Structure formats: C-alpha cells, structure tokens
Amino acid sequence: IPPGLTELLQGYTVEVLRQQPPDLVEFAVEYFTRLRSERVNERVKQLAEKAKEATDKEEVIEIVKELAELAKQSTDSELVNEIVKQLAEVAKEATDKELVIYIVKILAELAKQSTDSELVNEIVKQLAEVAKEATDKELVIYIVKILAELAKQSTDSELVNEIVKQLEEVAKEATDKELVEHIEKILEELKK
Amino acid sequence: IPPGLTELLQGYTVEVLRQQPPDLVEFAVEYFTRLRSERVNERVKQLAEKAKEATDKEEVIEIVKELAELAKQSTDSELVNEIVKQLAEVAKEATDKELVIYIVKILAELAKQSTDSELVNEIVKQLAEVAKEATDKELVIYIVKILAELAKQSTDSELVNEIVKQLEEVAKEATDKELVEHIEKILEELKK
C-alpha cells in the first residue's frame, strides 16, 4: 500500500458519513478537488514566502520555474490568477533584469495561450505595471509590443480597448521622448 | 455506511495499486472525474434513446427538462456540447411546435450565458438549422432575432461574422418574401 492511502480514504469516509451526500461520485469529485486546491494554494503561498526570503537570484529563478509550471498545468482560473499575482510580486522585487524579463515572458505566454478573458485582462494589467515601473526603454518597448501583439491577435474589442488604455498610461509615465512617440505610434495603429 | 461506498473505494484502490500514482489526491480527482463523466455520458445517451422511442410529447418534455438541467449544472464543455446535439435531434423530430419553441429557448439561454466561444458558435449553428427547417415565419423570425441578440451582445467579431453568415443562409432558404426582406434588414444592421 502506498503511503497515505488509508488516511486519505478515511478522511473522505468521515465526510460521507457526516454530510450524507445523495451521490458519492459527485461528492468525491468535490471532496478531492477541494483537497487538491487547498494543497496547491498552500504550495503557492510557501513559494511566495520563500521567494521573498531568498537572498540569491538562483533560488528565486527556481521558484519562478515551479510557479510557471504549476500555472501551465492547472485548469483552475482562480489558481492561475493567484500565481500571476505572485509572479508579479517577484518581478517587482527583482533587481536582476534577466529575472524580470523571464517573468514578463512567462506572463506573455500564459496570456497568449489563454481562452479566459478575465485572466488575459489581469495579465495585461500586470505587464503594464512592469512597464510603468521600468527605467530601461528597451524593456518598456518590449512589453508594449507584447501588449500590441495580444491586441492584434484578439477579436475581442473589449480587450483591445483595455490594452489601448493601458498603453496610453504607459506612454504618460515613460520619460524618454522618442520612446513615448514610439508608444503613441503603436497606439494609433491599434485604434485603427 | 451508505450503499456503494465500499465498492467505490475498492475501485479507486485497485487503480492506485495498479498505476502507482505519485500523487494520490491528483489521481483521485482524475479517477472520480472519469467515473462521473462516464455515468453522466451514459445518462444522456439513455435519455436520447428514450426521447426517440417516446410516443407522447409529455414524456419528451420531461426528458428535455432533465437534459436542460444537466447542461446547466455541468462545467464540462464536452458534455454540454453533446447535450446540445441531443436537444437539436429532439427539436428536429418534434412535431409539436410548443416543444420546438421550448428547445430553442433552452439553447438560447445556454448560449447567452456561456463564456465558451466554441459552445456558443455550435449553438448558433443549431439554432440556424431549426430556422432553416421551420415552415412557420413566426418561428423563423424569432430565431433570427435570438441570433441578432447574441451578435449585438458579443464583443467577439468572429462570432458576429459567423452569425451574419448563418442569417444569410436562413434568408436564402426562407420562402416568404416579406420574411426574407426582414431578415436582410436585420442582417445589414449587424454588418454595420
């Protein structure tokens, strides 16, 4: 017998006897989905604390890699959004530009592959936040072009309008005149 | 102990011992989701057979009601798509116009509430099929207006384009001159 099987089935048995569900299969899906959700949520919270306490870029990169793979393998929209929030905090904290770029690309890839419009909209806002904080025009224009790609690959006019609005604020907050003119040119293209 | 608990847990235990999964909770979610899916798929197949053998609309109406509630409570896009196909077959067979209207309204409500664009596109095609087969101009214009509502409530240009294409074919197949002009008038509005 593999370790934990007895305790796992005993836990489900207790709740069956307490709650007296009419359909044990339905109730099993609910019970074990909850346990899976509780465990992965705690793993994500543990990784976030570990990334916050880490004193080395290599430890943070390995945490980011595990978060990216958890997000990719999950179909739970709520969990992916929480992982996106936690990756955003790591990128904000990061002082190694390689790590910020790595996170930006994880977010870009998650957004481009997702069919959940609420999630893509949240990722748009997190990417624009990184661009607003950046003090490197090459990073800003990189993110702006990622957002422009999301807009042109979308047939959802509401997503396009939110990206346009985010890009207008990024142009407002950017300090290099040539960079601002470049963003405004990408903007007018999306408005057409 | 409730009936079936022992056998249910023994079945999961066999597969745990056969496949030796590294994560028993993950494996439980997979195992019980498959059993749930197998059982509801079989229920839908027997409802469809029962609807085909039924000899009175009252029995068919009760079957349609159970299919509509299974579709509403599921989060499995594949199952809902299969239920929509079975409702479409019931509407095709139906010779009581109240039953066809009832099915049209179930499909309309499913589509208007869904965030799954593949499902909405399939339902659009099923509604258009009912309109193409209809020999009652009041039913045709009802369905056309349902599709126009879906188009105007969508911000997805690809859904609007598919609806326009379906409406053009409905107008082609409709035989009443005033009805056709009405559909073409709704068509031009959507193209605008």
Author numbering:
A (entry chain A), B (entry chain B): 5 to 196
What does the paper say about this structure?
Here, we propose a method for generating proteins and protein complexes with complicated shapes using fusions of alpha helices. To design amino acid sequences that can stabilize the alpha helical structure of the fusion sites, we superimposed one or two turns of terminal alpha helices of connecting proteins using a molecular graphics program. Then, the amino acid residues important for forming a fused helical structure were chosen from the two natural sequences in the superimposed region. Our method does not require complicated computer calculations for the design process and can be used for the assembly of artificial protein complexes with predictable and rigid structures.
The helix fusion was designed by superimposing four amino acids of the second helix of the PKA_RIIα and the first alpha helix of DHR14. In the crystal structure, the two helices were fused into a single extended helix, as expected. The DHR14 module appears to be rotated ~8 degrees relative to the initial design, presumably because of an opportunistic interaction between the loops connecting the third and fourth repeats of the two DHR14 structures. This is presumed due to high structural flexibility at the fusion site because isolated PKA_RIIα and DHR14 proteins could be crystallized under multiple conditions using the same screening solutions.
